Structures are given as structure tokens and as C-alpha cells.
Design a protein around this nucleic acid. Structure first.
Ligand SMILES: [Mg+2]
Ligand SMILES: [Mg+2]
Ligand SMILES: [Mg+2]
Ligand SMILES: [Mg+2]
Ligand SMILES: [Mg+2]
Ligand SMILES: [Mg+2]
Ligand SMILES: [Mg+2]
Ligand SMILES: [Mg+2]
Ligand SMILES: [Mg+2]
Ligand SMILES: [Mg+2]
Ligand SMILES: [Mg+2]
Ligand SMILES: [Mg+2]
Ligand SMILES: [Mg+2]
Ligand SMILES: [Mg+2]
Ligand SMILES: [Mg+2]
Ligand SMILES: [Mg+2]
Ligand SMILES: [Mg+2]
Ligand SMILES: [Mg+2]
Ligand SMILES: [Mg+2]
Ligand SMILES: [Mg+2]
Ligand SMILES: [Mg+2]
Ligand SMILES: [Mg+2]
Ligand SMILES: [Mg+2]
Ligand SMILES: [Mg+2]
Ligand SMILES: [Mg+2]
Ligand SMILES: [Mg+2]
Ligand SMILES: [Mg+2]
Ligand SMILES: [Mg+2]
Ligand SMILES: [Mg+2]
Ligand SMILES: [Mg+2]
Ligand SMILES: [Mg+2]
Ligand SMILES: [Mg+2]
Ligand SMILES: [Mg+2]
Ligand SMILES: [Mg+2]
Ligand SMILES: [Mg+2]
Ligand SMILES: [Mg+2]
Ligand SMILES: [Mg+2]
Ligand SMILES: [Mg+2]
Ligand SMILES: [Mg+2]
Ligand SMILES: [Mg+2]
Ligand SMILES: [Mg+2]
Ligand SMILES: [Mg+2]
Ligand SMILES: [Mg+2]
Ligand SMILES: [Mg+2]
Ligand SMILES: [Mg+2]
Ligand SMILES: [Mg+2]
Ligand SMILES: [Mg+2]
Ligand SMILES: [Mg+2]
Ligand SMILES: [Mg+2]
Ligand SMILES: [Mg+2]
Ligand SMILES: [Mg+2]
Ligand SMILES: [Mg+2]
Ligand SMILES: [Mg+2]
Ligand SMILES: [Mg+2]
Ligand SMILES: [Mg+2]
Ligand SMILES: [Mg+2]
Ligand SMILES: [Mg+2]
Ligand SMILES: [Mg+2]
Ligand SMILES: [Mg+2]
Ligand SMILES: [Mg+2]
Ligand SMILES: [Mg+2]
Ligand SMILES: [Mg+2]
Ligand SMILES: [Mg+2]
Ligand SMILES: [Mg+2]
Ligand SMILES: [Mg+2]
Lengths: 112, 213, 116, 122, 54
RNA sequence: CUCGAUGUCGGCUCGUCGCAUCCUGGGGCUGGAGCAGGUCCCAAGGGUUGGGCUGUUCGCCCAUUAAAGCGGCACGCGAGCUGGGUUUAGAACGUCGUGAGACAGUUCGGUCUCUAUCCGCCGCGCGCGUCAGAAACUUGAGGAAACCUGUCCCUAGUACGAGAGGACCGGGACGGACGAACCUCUGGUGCACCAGUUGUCCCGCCAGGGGCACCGCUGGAUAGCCACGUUCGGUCAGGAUAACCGCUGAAAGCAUCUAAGCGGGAAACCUUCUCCAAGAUCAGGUUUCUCACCCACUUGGUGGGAUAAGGCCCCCCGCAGAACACGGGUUCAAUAGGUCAGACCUGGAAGCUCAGUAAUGGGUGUAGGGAACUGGUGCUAACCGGCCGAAAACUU
RNA sequence: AAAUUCCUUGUCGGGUAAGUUCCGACCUGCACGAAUGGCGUAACGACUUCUCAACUGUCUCAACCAUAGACUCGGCGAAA
RNA sequence: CAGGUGGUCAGGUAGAGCAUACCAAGGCGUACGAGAUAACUAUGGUUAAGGAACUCGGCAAAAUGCCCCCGUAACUUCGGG
């Protein structure tokens, strides 16, 4: 509980799935290209949750063309359409920063 | 017509607007004020209005200060400040005994916010005034954060006044201009103000309408 | 507890870990300790959190007291006699009393003791 | 963020592989360049038999950055290498195709040709 | 930096008079039927026999 | 002047002033079509970059810029720093000297001392004053600070021009630099946080732990502090002006910006914006509170003593802090600590149990441990108290 | 064009985005030269000099942490 | 008085070691203290993105680092490198 929870409570998004660091996630991002409003999917491994309620972020990481990319989104952000949980990973950390220096087979997470 | 209210900085959070942009907001609790005193130019020489804010126990307000709230018919408050007006049209809207709430400000308005900034103690010339300091290597001897020269030579044989030196920093009166009022929550007495507000969380804050808009 | 704001007792912070551990051993053994006043202040949230373990009184609470105290004889009397004594009291198991300062360096002294 | 004497991986088929930032264009004494900013650079490494040679002074546009960039919706994007694309003076690339993904901040900076050639615009 | 000149009698006395001990307040204590005087921060220990009156 | 010592080049740090102006601002003339300029007049508010080479100053060069101004202050600044150069003792080269040695010729190496007394400067207190003693809120005489500027778009491919080119004035959008506040975000830090792990010693042993090894090391990390971060700012409107442009108008039948008089007019000046500010000794204003005793005397605008309002020390503390000060609280109390529940950080404790020959792995169980943030709770300490603190009159 | 070249940052080539230093030559050697040795040389150097990879708070540009001081209290108590 | 002073004895676990870390036997806590998150100074530590742009000069810091097995250039006085 916090002092500013009554401010944040009409702004939290329900129906966000439970996901841990290590999971593989689809992120459906609203994109504005002129006057089109399409929807682009970012598929990757969750490497971070930094808590806080309305100010909670998460970071997802993929490998596009030999180049690792990380996106950091606010949880409860309205430019996320929805989040789909592909794969449950099995890790021992919480921040998973060691995946930033691994490539290929060695950057692969288990299946629990 | 410059408006004004007293409140408390409740800290920061973040909110999203209609174009889905993130907005860093400061929560000011623009609490229910009361007037208690009006300055007229025939009595006082100038034109203003006192404002009283904050719940206090009546055993903590001493006898000289209780008699001033007694002459206005108001229970004693904790804080007490004036809103300085222009000379024309003093208090045709302000009456002694009037309660002032958070919703004198509208959404999308602009406000000047003034408070007492955070105390930084005895600060050095690098922190206080942004000096560079000397280098970390190439022989430099024990002057890494020291100021350097403080003047000329035998002309003039003195240091000029207002030379930037070390000393105490903070606890100042700071006004921040042209802050956007993102939301006024009349249910709670809470203004969502875009940006930063001077002071610690819990401190007294004066919220006036902006002159520059 | 709240960590020390400022320089730690006895020089380093590893010396302070042993100053608090040796003073709590001597407190639970004699029921009363004469020391300097800043150490009596620093002992009070340290020692009251060990009595809260002895009020719970399980094996996992005993293994957690033994992380800080290297003396099994005083771990016995904390769990056999001090812990069950304070079972009806919700916090505040100690008391600091201010004593006359000592000759030699004019250090402010204080005693700290368990309540009854 | 990229300043002078930073080395960047060239991400098109002009023939270069490495450029050293000389200026960050866009004002007097501008410190840093992020995604979308234009650089004066010199070619340090180059493929044998290329359009560009070692020692040529070119203009480039940064497309990838190791330091995180705030987007106005509170999101962030971060890559693993600092990359650039050598351009003509009309903001068109000298090469014929782009390698790797590019940041989306090139869209308000009118780099429409680099966006169309890029494999993925995040 | 050495001193340039010795100070006069007026200038050394004005500084030296500000080296002075601050006395303490004394309140009243009756223990064992004896009226004593202690400082107020020692009032609880005086009532518990923890203070030696010499 | 100084030889019973006034430390000499460049750089670094921090500056301050001048205008003979580099940019931005206002003008006159032009061999000023436009766009660009040339030249002169006014103008010092702010601005005035990063590198390569050289001990360098200077200079040349690279890439930019609205521009990369020139000088003074012991060629500002070594009780602020540096020591590449000059300018000790070593050594070499060329040259001169019979030689010892010499060289505004070269070369490599070569101790930078000091606890701040006074004035000055930045901060912060104590005292007294302000004609009773106090408390709250304020006026602003007079100061401080700040002041930069670009690109694209619209007007408009219009005005101008044979063409190529290409506007003024007005309107809008997004910048760079600098600065202030702030901690929501991001990023850093983390010495009583969690976890993993190596060596060794110890807790009798197993198990579970601890001491030490830079916090042993490694992966994280709430709070505070912070920038690499987030927000905001230099807005607009006057007043009097500079160069310049006039109006009416003589002396001097015309004419003339001037001699009487009246206008226009710039980032300079004064207001307006922000901040300090009644020790502003001309010590201000509006209010509220106490509004009271007693003794001695050489009867004095006397000297005591005791109080009122009020304050202070003590005490519990603070995101206030070098000391001091300021702020909060003191039982009618949530002030700190404990305690209980949240938030968050870590990441699945111990014991038991099952699986495996074992190293280990699943279950019990989003477990256990835990500091700063939020809330309840009267358990511990805020106490059974000391010190200060209120008035001649008179004149109109 | 040198531990020697004043003029001088000689000129040309190389290296750099840019090189008064460096390497390669040229010869116009102010003032080179054969045991006060001449020109080379593998190995070696806390020697002088120039360049590269790696690496970093040296720097852009600083911010935080702990300790010893400075700071408060008590004791002793100098100096130029 | 943080300097200097020849020789003999020299245990354990790890280790190549009389190095180093922890310990035994045996010694010691060595002679001003107690507090306190000021600047600043010293000694340590860490640092996003960049990586010598610093400076007279990479000065200082960081980096490399062990054991076994592959593999190794110009030049050379035939050893080396
Ligand atoms: Mg979390
Ligand atoms: Mg502080
Ligand atoms: Mg620095
Ligand atoms: Mg020194
Ligand atoms: Mg140093
Ligand atoms: Mg000097
Ligand atoms: Mg701390
Ligand atoms: Mg100490
Ligand atoms: Mg240790
Ligand atoms: Mg003399
Ligand atoms: Mg100057
Ligand atoms: Mg002039
Ligand atoms: Mg002109
Ligand atoms: Mg100027
Ligand atoms: Mg001005
Ligand atoms: Mg170089
Ligand atoms: Mg000089
Ligand atoms: Mg000078
Ligand atoms: Mg000097
Ligand atoms: Mg001769
Ligand atoms: Mg000479
Ligand atoms: Mg020399
Ligand atoms: Mg000094
Ligand atoms: Mg004024
Ligand atoms: Mg600041
Ligand atoms: Mg936070
Ligand atoms: Mg963060
Ligand atoms: Mg621990
Ligand atoms: Mg074991
Ligand atoms: Mg031990
Ligand atoms: Mg943090
Ligand atoms: Mg004007
Ligand atoms: Mg004021
Ligand atoms: Mg004055
Ligand atoms: Mg007054
Ligand atoms: Mg107080
Ligand atoms: Mg809890
Ligand atoms: Mg388990
Ligand atoms: Mg078994
Ligand atoms: Mg198990
Ligand atoms: Mg030459
Ligand atoms: Mg040479
Ligand atoms: Mg040569
Ligand atoms: Mg000859
Ligand atoms: Mg011969
Ligand atoms: Mg001969
Ligand atoms: Mg020879
Ligand atoms: Mg040798
Ligand atoms: Mg520098
Ligand atoms: Mg002393
Ligand atoms: Mg000795
Ligand atoms: Mg010897
Ligand atoms: Mg041995
Ligand atoms: Mg040894
Ligand atoms: Mg000794
Ligand atoms: Mg400190
Ligand atoms: Mg770094
Ligand atoms: Mg890094
Ligand atoms: Mg590199
Ligand atoms: Mg290099
Ligand atoms: Mg350099
Ligand atoms: Mg330089
Ligand atoms: Mg070194
Ligand atoms: Mg090292
Ligand atoms: Mg070799």
C-alpha cells in the first residue's frame, strides 16, 4: 500500500497475464504510420520485471538479423493491445542480464 | 484575477493521456483553504487575501494566534500565507469565512508552483555552482575539487563581492513557472500537475494561476 | 533494522557486527549492561529482534539466532527463559536509562536492560 | 549516445565496415547523436574493391544505438551495436540495401528511403 | 601563513572571552529521604539509585 | 621603487572590466533590381565550438558554426594547481679555444615548502538596538540574478528579374547550447539486503551456519544522493532613448527636424518576470495576546524579588544540519524504536518426505529472509522541571 | 636537413579527417667523416622517440560508497 | 621515534614454493578517547553510452596473468628471436 494508490487505481489495466522473467511473450504494439494505425508483434524473452504497480516495466529481448534488440514497455500501457504467453521458462535469476552476452544455442532457456 | 491555493506535495506518479503518451505528474493535495483576513488599500496600503491551511490541534496554537482566528470566526489552522493581488478589484469575490477548494483550477490550465527546496547542507563549489574542478591525474596535487583562483593580483587587492564560493545550498524559495494542470480530482482535493514541484514530500506548496500561461 | 547513518561503531562495519553481537550476548546473560549511550541506542532494535525469534520459538527461529550469536549457552536461555517470559508483551522488550558520563573521555554512558 | 571518436558499424553495402564520428551535426557544440541524427565520419575499415575507400570523409545517419532511447509513450528501445548508414546529401543511402533492423525514429527525420529498404523497422 | 603582527589587548580579549563553559540546569530529587540536585536527563537514574552523589 | 628575495613562458581553474563589435539588434549611403554584399553610424544584454601538429604564445590545417571578436587587469590568476619550455650541478653533438672552458646552437635527464593573524570574499550564529513585554502575517527604499540562437513550413516560386535566381514584413512548427527544480521513467551507486560460490578455520560430528580473505569474489538490488534522466525557463506589454526619420516653424518675405513646441524609434536604460530585503538607526505597516504584584532606599526614568502572555535549556526525533540554527513531537502523544499487515527487493529457506549408486532433482510452498516507503498498534523512551521573561514623563 | 641543418614547419613520398614530431629519400654538409674511429649489426635496455591492437573515470562529465583526518565534546598542549 | 641491526629454530590445510590465504604452539590488541552521514584532502571501491577525444607525454588507473595440449613470423652471429 502507498500514499498515491487512489490516483493510480482508475488507471490500472486488468486482463494482463501473469508472466515471469524467462518466458517467451508476444507483445502487440500499436503503431501509427501516418494515418494507418496498424499493429506490430514483438516476440521475445522476458528478461526483467521492475515492480511498482502503474510504474511497473518489463523488458523483452529478441534476435532480429544477427542483432539483439530489447524493448522496455510499461505494464499497464495503453499502446499494448494484448500480451500472449507463448512459453514458460525455467530460470534461477530475476534480471537475466547474462543473456546480453550469449548467442545462439547458449542463449536458450529451459521449458518449465 | 489571479487565483491561489495552499497544499501539500504528496509525491510523484505517472499517468497516460488521450494520445497514449506518458505524463510525469506531481500530486499536490490542494486542500480546503479558508480566508481569515483581507488586505484592503485603505487599511493596509495594498491588496491581498490571507489563506489558512492544515489541520492542527487547538492546544498547539498559542494565545496570541488564537485571538486572530477568533476575530475571523475560524478554527485555527497550521499554515497561513497571503495571496498578493493587483490593486484593482480587491475582494469582490473573497469574503472572510469563505472555503476554497481544489476546483478553482480547470483542466488544461497553467499554474505557478512555489515551495521550499530541499536542503543540501554545506556544499562545495562543484556541487553548488557547477564548477569544473582540476584534473584527476597528470601530477595535480590535492586540488581535484578546489575552486582555483579567486581573483587577480595587486590590482585590485581584493576579492569582488558576489564571488561564487562554497557554503550552504538549498532550503530556498523556488518558483516553477507554467506547469500544466493535467487533472483536478475534486473528489479528493488532488491536482495532477505535469512535471516537478520544489520541496520534499509533505511540504507546503502554494499553487497560483500562471501569468505567462 | 535501519542502518547507521554516519560512521559505524568501532571503525569498520565488520567491527560493528561483533560489537552488537557481543553486547546482545552480555545483555541476555546478565539482564543489564552498562555501555556508552550510542551503543545502547544501537543495541535496542538489534536485541529486540532476537527476542521476537525466541517468542516464535521454532527450529528455524533458533537457526536464525545462531547466525548472529556464537554462544550456545545464551541461546538456550533466550529460548528457554527470556522468550517465554515476553510472550504476553507486543514489542518494547528493553529500556535505556541515562547515567553520569565517565571520567577520562567524558563519554555519555547509559544502561540498557530487559523490562521486568 | 555517440560523440566524436566513436566507431560505428556500417550497415549497408557501400563497401565500408567501420566509420569514426567526427562531428555530430545539428548545432554549435552539440554533444551526442542518437537514432536519426546525422554524422560526419571517416572510413576506417573497408571491403577490398568497394565504392568507398579508407580515408574518405562521408556523411552518415545513426540507425542503431546501445544506449536506451525514450519514446513518447514511455517505452524504450535498445540494440547491441552502434550502427550507421552512409547517405547522399538528399538523405538517400549510397548503398542499395540495409542490414539489420533500424529504429523507428528515422520516420519523423524524413529518412523514408532507408525505412523502405530496411528489413525491420522497430 | 604566519601571523603578521601580535594582537592588541583589546583584540585578543574579545575572542578569548567566548571560550566559556555552558552550565547545566539542575532539578530536585528526593531519594532515601534526602534532597539532592541532578541534571534533568539523569532524573530517571537518580530515582533508581543508579547515580552516585559522592 | 624593490638585491637583509617584488617567483619569470605556456596550459589548467575561476574570473572581472573596456569597446576600437565577430554574431545577434537599429540605421544612412551605395557603381543597393532581387538574393547576397561594400562602407559608415548607433549598440557591450547574452553568446563566441571540438580536434591534428608544436613546450609553445602565435600560426597553419580538419570538421562544424548565427559567429568561432580584439584588448586590459604584476604580458589577471604557482601561500589555487601543473612543470613541457627558459635558467644550476650530469652527459653528448656541431662550432670556438693551446687549455681550463664557452655558445639567444642542438640533444637526453634533472626536490615546486607554509597549521591563515588582519583586510577582502562565501556561508552561519551570539549580543544589543528599534521607548512595555511577546506572537503571527506582511510593505519594498535599495540590491542580486537572468537575458543566446538556429533550421524547416505558410505567405510565395508571389514582389524583383530578359533569364538564372529569389524576398522584406507578418504567421506556425520542431531544435542546439546554458540554467533551475525534481526522482515518475530510464541509468548509476549501494559496507546491518537476498542469493550463488572458492580457500581455510571454528560452532563435538552430520546437516545447517559463522569468522577471515578489497564489502573475499560473483549475479541482483527498495530508500537516500544523483545525470546519462524527467519537467520548466529566458514570455508578452509598456516608459524614456541612441544613430537615424520626421511634423509644424522663425531668426533670414524663400527655405530649414529647432531656436518656442510635438512625434516615430534598438537584444543597451527603467518598469514588468524570478529571488534577497526594515541593523532601510527615517530600524516601517496591519493585527492579536498579556495588560500584573512585593520589598528595601541616599525616593533616583533607583535597586531588587516574584510573576503573566511568551520563550529557552533538558528530553524523543527529522529527507534540517560542521557547531549553532531551523522544523516536528512530548501521554488529550503515532515522535523515534519495537510489533502487526501491506508495498518493494531477492528468487524457491529450514525440517520432513519421495526419486537417483551418487553428484543432485521434484513436492510441502510465489517459499523463506529483509533496511529506508505506507498504514494500524499505547509495548519501550519522550520524565514527578528548571531557567528567563511586562511601561518615568512632558509640550502643542 | 643528422643526439650535428642557421635559414626552417627546406622540398618530395608515406602514415592521419587534419602530422612544426615520426619513417623514406634528395644534397643546397651555416658547422659530416674514418681507433676524440667511419658506416652497418642479431641479441639485450625501469634509456630517448613515433605508430597500432587490447584496455580503461585520463577525458566528454561527473555521480555515489567506506575508512583516516578536518568537525563537536572532554584531557594534555606547542610553533613559525 | 612507521627508519636501521648479523646468525639459529621454523608445525597444519591449500600451493611448485621459506610466495599467498586461513589457522596451531606461542604471543598480542602498543599508551589519548568518545561522537558525528558538512565542504575539502588522503586511502580504497564501483560506474550507463563512448574509448586517449586527456596530456608536454596513456602520467596514473584498467588490462594480461595459472596448468596441460596445439601452434608460432621477419631477421640472425645459428645460440636465438
Ligand atoms: Mg518485482
Ligand atoms: Mg544531509
Ligand atoms: Mg573532472
Ligand atoms: Mg602534498
Ligand atoms: Mg590526489
Ligand atoms: Mg599569488
Ligand atoms: Mg546509508
Ligand atoms: Mg574516530
Ligand atoms: Mg570482512
Ligand atoms: Mg623584507
Ligand atoms: Mg578577459
Ligand atoms: Mg561605438
Ligand atoms: Mg547596411
Ligand atoms: Mg559580450
Ligand atoms: Mg535589460
Ligand atoms: Mg595521435
Ligand atoms: Mg602573468
Ligand atoms: Mg593573459
Ligand atoms: Mg604559472
Ligand atoms: Mg680544436
Ligand atoms: Mg646561456
Ligand atoms: Mg630539457
Ligand atoms: Mg587553506
Ligand atoms: Mg526595488
Ligand atoms: Mg541544481
Ligand atoms: Mg522510487
Ligand atoms: Mg533505475
Ligand atoms: Mg546478512
Ligand atoms: Mg558440512
Ligand atoms: Mg579467526
Ligand atoms: Mg534507486
Ligand atoms: Mg520597448
Ligand atoms: Mg519576504
Ligand atoms: Mg544599505
Ligand atoms: Mg516592526
Ligand atoms: Mg524544537
Ligand atoms: Mg514487514
Ligand atoms: Mg523446492
Ligand atoms: Mg536414496
Ligand atoms: Mg530437497
Ligand atoms: Mg622537415
Ligand atoms: Mg629525428
Ligand atoms: Mg629522416
Ligand atoms: Mg671541417
Ligand atoms: Mg687516421
Ligand atoms: Mg682520429
Ligand atoms: Mg663509438
Ligand atoms: Mg642494466
Ligand atoms: Mg579538459
Ligand atoms: Mg579539544
Ligand atoms: Mg622503532
Ligand atoms: Mg640487512
Ligand atoms: Mg608452510
Ligand atoms: Mg607470509
Ligand atoms: Mg607505540
Ligand atoms: Mg564523508
Ligand atoms: Mg564508464
Ligand atoms: Mg560499460
Ligand atoms: Mg575499442
Ligand atoms: Mg590509439
Ligand atoms: Mg590528443
Ligand atoms: Mg588537447
Ligand atoms: Mg603506467
Ligand atoms: Mg592494477
Ligand atoms: Mg624485435
Amino acid at each position: 500500500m502507498n500514499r498515491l494508490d487512489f490516483v493510480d487505481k482508475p488507471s490500472l489495466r486488468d486482463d494482463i497475464p501473469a508472466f515471469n522473467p524467462g518466458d517467451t511473450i508476444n507483445v502487440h504494439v500499436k503503431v501509427i504510420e501516418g494515418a494507418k494505425e496498424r499493429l506490430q508483434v514483438f516476440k521475445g524473452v522476458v528478461i526483467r520485471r521492475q515492480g511498482g504497480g502503474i510504474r511497473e516495466t518489463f523488458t523483452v529481448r529478441k534476435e532480429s538479423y544477427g542483432v539483439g534488440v530489447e524493448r522496455t514497455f510499461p505494464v499497464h500501457s495503453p499502446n499494448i493491445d494484448h500480451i500472449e504467453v507463448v512459453t514458460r521458462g525455467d530460470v534461477r535469476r530475476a534480471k537475466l542480464y547474462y543473456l546480453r552476452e550469449l548467442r545462439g544455442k547458449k542463449a536458450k532457456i529451459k521449458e518449465k | 484575477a489571479r487565483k491561489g491555493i495552499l497544499g501539500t506535495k504528496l509525491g510523484m506518479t505517472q499517468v497516460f493521456d488521450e494520445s497514449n503518451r506518458v505524463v510525469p505528474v506531481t500530486v499536490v493535495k490542494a486542500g480546503p483553504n479558508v480566508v481569515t483576513r483581507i488586505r484592503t488599500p485603505e487599511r493596509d496600503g495594498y491588496s491581498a487575501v490571507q489563506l489558512a491551511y492544515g489541520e492542527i490541534s487547538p492546544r498547539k496554537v498559542n494565545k496570541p494566534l488564537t485571538g486572530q482566528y477568533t476575530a475571523a470566526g475560524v478554527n485555527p489552522r497550521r499554515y497561513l500565507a497571503e495571496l498578493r493581488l493587483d490593486d484593482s478589484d480587491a475582494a469582490t469575490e473573497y469574503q472572510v469565512g469563505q472555503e476554497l477548494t481544489a476546483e478553482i483550477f480547470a483542466d488544461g490550465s497553467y499554474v505557478d508552483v512555489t515551495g521550499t527546496s530541499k536542503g543540501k547542507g554545506f556544499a562545495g563549489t562543484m556541487k553548488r555552482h557547477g564548477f569544473r574542478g582540476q584534473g584527476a591525474s597528470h601530477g595535480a596535487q590535492a586540488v581535484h575539487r578546489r575552486p582555483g583562483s579567486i581573483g587577480g593580483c595587486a590590482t585590485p587587492a581584493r576579492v569582488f563581492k558576489g564571488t561564487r564560493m562554497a557554503g550552504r545550498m538549498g532550503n530556498d524559495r523556488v518558483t516553477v513557472l507554467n506547469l500544466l494542470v493535467h487533472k483536478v480530482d475534486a473528489e479528493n482535493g488532488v491536482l495532477l500537475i505535469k512535471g516537478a514541484v520544489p520541496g520534499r514530500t509533505g511540504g507546503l506548496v502554494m499553487v497560483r494561476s500562471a501569468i505567462k500561461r | 533494522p535501519k542502518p547507521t547513518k554516519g560512521p559505524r561503531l568501532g571503525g569498520s562495519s565488520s567491527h560493528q557486527k561483533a560489537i552488537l553481537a557481543n553486547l546482545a550476548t552480555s545483555l541476555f546473560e546478565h539482564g543489564r549492561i552498562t555501555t556508552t549511550e550510542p551503543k545502547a541506542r544501537a543495541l535496542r532494535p538489534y536485541a529486540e529482534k532476537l527476542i521476537t525469534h525466541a517468542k516464535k520459538g521454532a527450529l528455524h527461529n533458533r537457526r536464525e539466532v545462531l547466525k548472529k550469536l556464537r554462544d550456545k549457552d545464551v541461546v538456550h536461555t533466550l529460548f528457554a527463559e527470556i522468550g517465554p517470559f515476553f510472550a504476553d508483551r507486543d514489542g518494547g522488550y528493553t529500556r535505556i536509562i541515562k547515567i553520569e558520563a565517565r571520567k577520562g573521555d567524558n563519554a555519555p554512558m547509559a544502561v540498557i536492560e530487559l523490562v521486568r | 549516445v555517440i560523440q566524436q571518436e566513436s566507431r560505428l558499424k556500417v550497415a549497408d553495402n557501400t563497401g565500408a565496415k567501420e566509420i569514426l564520428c567526427i562531428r555530430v551535426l545539428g548545432g554549435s557544440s552539440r554533444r551526442y547523436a542518437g537514432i536519426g541524427d546525422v554524422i560526419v565520419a571517416t572510413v576506417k575499415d573497408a571491403i577490398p574493391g568497394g565504392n568507398v575507400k579508407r580515408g574518405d570523409v562521408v556523411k552518415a545517419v545513426v540507425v542503431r544505438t546501445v544506449k536506451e532511447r525514450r519514446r513518447p509513450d514511455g517505452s524504450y528501445i535498445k540494440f547491441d551495436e552502434n550502427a550507421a548508414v552512409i547517405i547522399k546529401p538528399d538523405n538517400d543511402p549510397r548503398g542499395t540495401r540495409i542490414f539489420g533492423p533500424v529504429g523507428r525514429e528515422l520516420r519523423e527525420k524524413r529518412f523514408m528511403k532507408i525505412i523502405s529498404l530496411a528489413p525491420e523497422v522497430l | 601563513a604566519v601571523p603578521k603582527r601580535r594582537k592588541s589587548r583589546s583584540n585578543t580579549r574579545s575572542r578569548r572571552s567566548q571560550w566559556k563553559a555552558a552550565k547545566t540546569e539542575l532539578v530536585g530529587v528526593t531519594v532515601a529521604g534526602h534532597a539532592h540536585k541532578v541534571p534533568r536527563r539523569l532524573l530517571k537514574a537518580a530515582r533508581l539509585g543508579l547515580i552516585d552523589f559522592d
